[PDB]
Design a protein that fits this description.
part of a larger assembly, 6 chains, A mainly alpha (about 120), B little secondary structure (about 50), C mainly beta (about 100), D alpha/beta (about 150), E alpha+beta (about 110), F mainly alpha (about 140), A: about 120 residues, about 65% helix, about 0% strand, F: about 140 residues, mainly alpha, two-stranded antiparallel sheet, about 5% strand, binds magnesium ion, RNA-binding, ribosome
Chain lengths: ~120, ~50, ~100, ~150, ~110, ~140
RNA sequence: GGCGGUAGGGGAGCGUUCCCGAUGCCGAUGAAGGCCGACCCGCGAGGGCGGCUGGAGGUAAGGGAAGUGCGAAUGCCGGCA
RNA sequence: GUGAGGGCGCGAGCGAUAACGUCCGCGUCCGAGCGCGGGAACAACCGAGACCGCCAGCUAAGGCCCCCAAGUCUGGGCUAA
RNA sequence: AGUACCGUGAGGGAAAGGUGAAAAGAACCCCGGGAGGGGAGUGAAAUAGAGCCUGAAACCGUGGGCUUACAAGCAGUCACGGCCCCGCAAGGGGUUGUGGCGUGCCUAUUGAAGCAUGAGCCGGCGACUCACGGUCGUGGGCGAGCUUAAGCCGUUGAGGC
């Protein structure tokens, strides 16, 4: 019984070569190079997922300290407010209220200023 | 073969790029007073003739 | 009225009636669950003690569902170390209804 | 790479040649070279302990007996080797062709008869063997046969 | 209706004629005849010969009016190479590829 | 799913200059060039204020900076490193000081360049009185 | 409650060739192979479905035996750059 | 399998109270954690042991004037280089 | 095919198989010196048209969609926005503007993106087997026993002695 390669290898290559569609130049036409790229990208994506968090963690903090500044306080001071004033509400994200419903935000600014000191 | 030698296969893009200015241009032709045919300027041509 | 509910370990606001996908939840295929877990309102309701001591949001479990597959794919160089996991994450579809405060 | 038809010479020097490095086309890394641990004729047979061979035959027969398919007979009325005969004969016997029948008998003529049938496998008494037993859904045999079966194990 | 015409196996390099073809693409038939006739390239000869045989077929087989058809499209693909040796100093020997061309020219009715 | 801001409209400002400390002014200034004060802010977009400075010639600076603070500038040529003390800058084109001070505090990408155009520096005061001149401090 | 991992030890699986299964079943209303998918099942290697090609083969469930999986060896043959 | 080890802290010899030097002892990290945050960048220095997912949350070292998250924070001194 | 070719010679030693059920292998006309095309015609099929079944990949080309001439780069990846294409929809597909992040694969090594090795690219060929004997584990048969070798009879995919 001789088991020639047969279809197998082609299929494996093509399977991958699809994954690499769109990649610049020889890096989507040659199996070998595309593969090498995918390795990297796989690791990239997975590392950037963990990042996506950090990025918005920040994006929101800027907005907050932004509109939180208009009423008259540092993000630091403002946080200390709601963290002390019981409101574990507004996961930083939902302090998007600064954009729609500024009044609601403002409510949270005095509530904070107050119980803060 | 000897001393200087290309370090890396020219990219198929970087190649065609070099061929930027390679395209040709149409010959400059004109209708002649003689026949209705076309001549290049300043040139006696068949089906036509000239004058002195 | 805007209404911030917490659930599946994540905060989201909610409009009177609309579809929302949330971390999978233990409930019937088509039942109803309250997210008594709720903060604020569109008529200004600072959530004092973390949660409003009295308020609720009602929603219908429009159905469960998996999610488009992601390829978690580790690769450590010089060390022939490759790993390819497929991962699709479960969830459920809440249709909002009563934001009864 | 020894039995292949090529010669010994070193394809080329192996030093300041720029070419790879080699001995002779025989080398299994050539296309048209020798094969590696490719197959060579070998005896696949072995000696399965006798106790076991019998146990098997007994258990095989039995399995059919316990299934009710086993059916000893002596009444072979359709004699002269002639399929039609055995055909009609099996009709009576309750063998129609809905199930495969391993027929076992001493009489070569009964053999001749059933032989050409595509749902029957003819076989002498000494031929009894698990594979054939197991193959067919239905065992049926001559008394002289069933006897020389008990002879082997009884 | 469109109207094809193809010269296979034309013994000449692709890169070479492709230059001349790309000169007539999307052109008036009469203009092309004019260009090709006077354009200075070995490739003119072949591209012209086919460009013609196309118009021919266009009229005698697909009854388009010679007076209006134009170059709807026209390309040139590479046919099998033609390899020769080329003896070289100190005994090396490069193999010179004499390439070849398939030239297509499709013509179409002037307009509507 | 976080809010992405739409097409806003430039808010021109008008910062003074005289008296203000070089560094400390620049700081504020850039945070306007980037929108980072406006809550509706977003990195990828670029929508900070059109800052306009006047009388930059009257920028103050602590210590011997007028003498010590030298700028470098390397022409591609050999020995082409040409240095220049703060004095000389303020003497000649002065806004130049305030300009780079800010430039050096803007992000290094393309929009960082785009952001630089947003800044109009002078010494007069008096700019081209476009429209908005909302004074600030 | 544990779960980074090279050399290495252990375990479970996927796929190629061939055999029993087979005097069978799939198959021109379309076999193998090729091309294509944003679908379905599998953690995965894979498996399935659908359209296009292709024109005659293919081979379950459960087992069995191996010339059984390639990116590299200045590897070998060919094609093209 | 391994029998080239490497750096760092400490304790000695050698060395010149030289060396990304060497040679032992104890420990440690890299090796195999060139995975993640800090140190501009940087195996082994500080922080921490990555099963996968999350546009949640607290903190570690480090850091909070702008590039760059977060105080141009409060109070008392010193320094003019 | 021991041929072509290589070697003075002993001697080395290739590549190269497939239309179609049938030749029905394309009369005749058309452009062309011819080759080769277009039409006509044969055929179930002619992208079966003659080194002609299938016809993959690298590689070359025409057309279309998106994008690019103030930009800094292991070519990805994460986010957002534009444009084009699917779809009742919500969604989805293609492209890439800006923003964040990011030192190729293998090998060898105390340590490599490494200015250390290997690889132009693609396709196919390519490396832990087998026999006997050992040793342990393992699924069975029998057990103070267990088992047969060569061979003989039988069979021609039958076992038995
Ligand atoms: Mg193989
Ligand atoms: Mg598939
Ligand atoms: Mg992409
Ligand atoms: Mg990589
Ligand atoms: Mg945070
Ligand atoms: Mg607003
Ligand atoms: Mg509103
Ligand atoms: Mg030009
Ligand atoms: Mg005259
Ligand atoms: Mg309550
Ligand atoms: Mg790496
Ligand atoms: Mg290694
Ligand atoms: Mg490496
Ligand atoms: Mg490896
Ligand atoms: Mg109410
Ligand atoms: Mg020979
Ligand atoms: Mg020989
Ligand atoms: Mg030999
Ligand atoms: Mg010899
Ligand atoms: Mg040598
Ligand atoms: Mg070489
Ligand atoms: Mg060799
Ligand atoms: Mg040898
Ligand atoms: Mg050969
Ligand atoms: Mg051969
Ligand atoms: Mg051979
Ligand atoms: Mg019974
Ligand atoms: Mg029945
Ligand atoms: Mg000419
Ligand atoms: Mg006409
Ligand atoms: Mg062309
Ligand atoms: Mg010469
Ligand atoms: Mg060449
Ligand atoms: Mg003033
Ligand atoms: Mg002075
Ligand atoms: Mg100098
Ligand atoms: Mg000078
Ligand atoms: Mg002015
Ligand atoms: Mg668990
Ligand atoms: Mg593990
Ligand atoms: Mg195992
Ligand atoms: Mg075979
Ligand atoms: Mg059928
Ligand atoms: Mg049908
Ligand atoms: Mg097959
Ligand atoms: Mg087969
Ligand atoms: Mg299919
Ligand atoms: Mg099977
Ligand atoms: Mg092998
Ligand atoms: Mg390998
Ligand atoms: Mg190779
Ligand atoms: Mg070659
Ligand atoms: Mg080659
Ligand atoms: Mg070449
Ligand atoms: Mg040692
Ligand atoms: Mg040591
Ligand atoms: Mg050690
Ligand atoms: Mg040590
Ligand atoms: Mg030292
Ligand atoms: Mg360790
Ligand atoms: Mg690092
Ligand atoms: Mg350092
Ligand atoms: Mg390390
Ligand atoms: Mg480190
Ligand atoms: Mg906190
Ligand atoms: Mg702290
Ligand atoms: Mg701290
Ligand atoms: Mg102080
Ligand atoms: Mg002080
Ligand atoms: Mg021959
Ligand atoms: Mg021959
Ligand atoms: Mg010959
Ligand atoms: Mg000769
Ligand atoms: Mg000779
Ligand atoms: Mg050959
Ligand atoms: Mg031949
Ligand atoms: Mg004939
Ligand atoms: Mg013809
Ligand atoms: Mg005629
Ligand atoms: Mg003629
Ligand atoms: Mg003629
Ligand atoms: Mg012809
Ligand atoms: Mg002809
Ligand atoms: Mg025709
Ligand atoms: Mg017909
Ligand atoms: Mg038909
Ligand atoms: Mg066909
Ligand atoms: Mg041919
Ligand atoms: Mg055929
Ligand atoms: Mg194009
Ligand atoms: Mg184009
Ligand atoms: Mg399109
Ligand atoms: Mg276009
Ligand atoms: Mg760029
Ligand atoms: Mg990017
Ligand atoms: Mg559309
Ligand atoms: Mg539809
Ligand atoms: Mg709807
Ligand atoms: Mg699309
Ligand atoms: Mg890093
Ligand atoms: Mg080495
Ligand atoms: Mg070394
Ligand atoms: Mg090692
Ligand atoms: Mg390099
Ligand atoms: Mg070297
Ligand atoms: Mg290298
Ligand atoms: Mg070496
Ligand atoms: Mg290597
Ligand atoms: Mg090299
Ligand atoms: Mg070469
Ligand atoms: Mg290959
Ligand atoms: Mg036992
Ligand atoms: Mg025999």
């Amino acid at each position: 019984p001789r088991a020639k390669t047969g279809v197998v290898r082609r299929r494996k290559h093509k399977k991958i070569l699809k994954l690499a569609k769109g990649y610049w130049g020889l890096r989507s036409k040659s199996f070998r190079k595309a593969r090498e790229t995918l390795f990297a990208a796989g690791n990239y994506a997975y590392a950037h997922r963990k990042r996506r968090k950090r990025d918005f963690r920040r994006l929101w903090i800027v907005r907050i300290n932004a509109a939180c500044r208009q009423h008259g306080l540092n993000y630091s001071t403002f946080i200390h407010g709601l963290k002390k004033a019981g409101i574990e509400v507004d996961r930083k994200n939902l302090a998007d209220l600064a954009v729609r419903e500024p009044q609601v935000f403002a409510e949270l600014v005095e509530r904070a200023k107050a119980a803060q000191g | 073969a000897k001393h200087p030698v290309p370090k890396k296969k020219t990219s198929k893009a970087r190649r065609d790029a070099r061929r930027s200015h390679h395209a040709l241009t149409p010959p400059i032709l004109v209708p002649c007073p003689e026949c209705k045919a076309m001549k290049p300027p300043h040139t006696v041509c068949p089906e036509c003739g000239y004058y002195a | 009225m805007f209404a911030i509910v917490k659930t599946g370990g994540k905060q989201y606001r909610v409009e009177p009636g609309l579809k929302l996908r949330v971390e999978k939840l233990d409930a019937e295929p088509g039942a109803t669950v309250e997210l008594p877990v709720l903060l604020l309102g569109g008529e200004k309701t600072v959530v004092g003690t973390p949660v409003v001591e009295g308020a609720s949001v009602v929603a219908e479990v429009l159905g469960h569902g998996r999610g488009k597959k992601i390829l978690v794919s580790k690769f450590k160089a010089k060390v022939q170390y490759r790993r390819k996991k497929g991962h699709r994450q479960p969830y459920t579809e809440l249709l909002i209804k009563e934001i009864r405060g | 790479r020894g039995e292949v038809a090529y010669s010994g010479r070193k394809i080329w020097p192996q030093k300041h040649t720029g070419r790879a490095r080699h001995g002779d086309i025989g080398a299994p890394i050539f296309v048209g070279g020798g094969v590696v641990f490719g197959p060579k004729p070998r005896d696949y047979s072995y000696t399965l302990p006798k106790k076991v061979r019998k146990k098997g035959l007994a258990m095989a027969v039995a399995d059919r007996a316990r299934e009710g398919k086993l059916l000893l007979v002596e009444a072979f009325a359709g004699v002269n080797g002639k399929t039609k005969e055995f055909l009609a004969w099996a009709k009576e016997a309750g063998l129609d062709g809905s199930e495969s029948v391993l027929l076992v008998t001493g009489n070569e003529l009964v053999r001749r008869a059933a032989r050409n049938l595509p749902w029957v496998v003819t076989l002498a008494p000494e031929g009894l063997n698990v594979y054939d037993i197991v193959r067919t859904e239905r065992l049926v045999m001559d008394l002289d046969a069933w006897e020389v079966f008990q002879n082997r194990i009884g | 209706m469109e109207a094809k015409a193809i010269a296979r196996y034309v013994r000449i390099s692709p890169r070479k004629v492709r230059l001349v073809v790309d000169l007539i693409r999307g052109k008036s038939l009469e203009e092309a005849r004019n260009i090709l006739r006077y354009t200075n390239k070995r490739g003119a000869y072949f591209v012209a010969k086919v460009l013609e045989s196309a118009a021919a077929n266009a009229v005698n087989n697909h009854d388009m009016l010679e007076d209006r058809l134009y170059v709807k499209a026209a390309y040139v693909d590479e046919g099998p190479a033609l390899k020769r040796v080329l003896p070289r100093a100190r005994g090396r020997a490069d193999i010179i590829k004499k390439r070849t061309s398939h030239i297509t020219v499709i013509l179409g009715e002037k307009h509507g | 799913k976080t809010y992405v801001p739409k097409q806003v409209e430039p808010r021109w400002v008008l910062i003074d200059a005289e008296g203000k400390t070089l560094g400390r002014l620049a700081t504020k200034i850039a945070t306007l060039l980037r929108g980072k004060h406006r809550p509706d802010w977003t990195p990828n977009v670029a929508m900070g204020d059109f800052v306009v400075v006047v009388n930059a010639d009257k920028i103050r600076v602590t210590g011997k900076k007028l003498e010590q603070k030298i700028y470098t500038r390397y022409s591609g040529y050999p020995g082409g490193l040409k240095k220049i003390p703060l004095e000389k800058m303020l003497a000649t084109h002065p806004e130049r000081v305030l300009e780079h001070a800010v430039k050096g505090m803007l992000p290094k990408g393309p929009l960082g360049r785009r952001l630089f155009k947003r800044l109009k520096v002078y010494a007069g005061p008096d700019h081209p009185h476009q429209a908005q001149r909302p004074e600030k401090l």
